[PDB]
Amino acid sequence: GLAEKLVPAKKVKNGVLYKSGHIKVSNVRCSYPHLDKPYPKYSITLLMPKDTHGAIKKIIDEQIELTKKNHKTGALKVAPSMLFIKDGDVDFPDKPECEGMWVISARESTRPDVLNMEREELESPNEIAEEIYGGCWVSSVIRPWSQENKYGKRINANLLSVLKRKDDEPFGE
Numbered sequence: 001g002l003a004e005k006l007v008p009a010k011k012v013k014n015g016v017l018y019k020s021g022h023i024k025v026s027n028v029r030c031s032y033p034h035l036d037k038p039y040p041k042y043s044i045t046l047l048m049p050k051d052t053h054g055a056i057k058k059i060i061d062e063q064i065e066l067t068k069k070n071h072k073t074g075a076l077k078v079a080p081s082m083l084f085i086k087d088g089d090v091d092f093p094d095k096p097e098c099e100g101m102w103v104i105s106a107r108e109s110t111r112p113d114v115l116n117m118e119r120e121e122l123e124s125p126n127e128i129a130e131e132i133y134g135g136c137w138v139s140s141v142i143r144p145w146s147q148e149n150k151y152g153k154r155i156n157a158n159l160l161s162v163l164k165r166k167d168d169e170p171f172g173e
Contacts, residue, residue: 030046030136031097
């Protein structure tokens with residue numbers, strides 16, 4: 001799978017930047033998983049605790065700037081509201097699980113690698129949905145991409161892998 005192919009560039013607390021621009025965010029809480037079947041797109045929201053993910057957030061900001069620079073129509077300007085990463089303490093007032101979190105949204109049209117706690121690829125949609133529920137903790141590999149169309153200018157994140165890390169209280173989404 002993906003993990004065996006990636007070549008690390010920089011490892012920090014709770015994260016890795018790869019030479020290919022992939023970013024691993026480790027030990028984050030998931031929300032709204034759509035890993036079983038597309039919904040077409042697969043998707044997840046990652047709630048990344050600010051106090052333990054500062055360095056990887058800094059790297060994410062840097063990679064967002066690189067992605068703007070290399071957009072296919074030339075350097076792309078994107079407002080903070082149109083990025084895949086948002087501030088849980090400002091942009092999610094009525095969602096308490098977002099307190100003290102960076103909120104990352106990632107999507108893909110093809111299924112990401114989905115690994116259970118034993119680092120085994122899952123295949124059954126029902127098993128995937130049971131294994132990785134909203135509220136559990138995961139680690140995930142994402143990579144930014146730039147978009148410019150009639151609906152706006154965005155920096156999005158491809159969802160490339162999700163690894164189950166720990167059980168916790170379900171959000172019941």
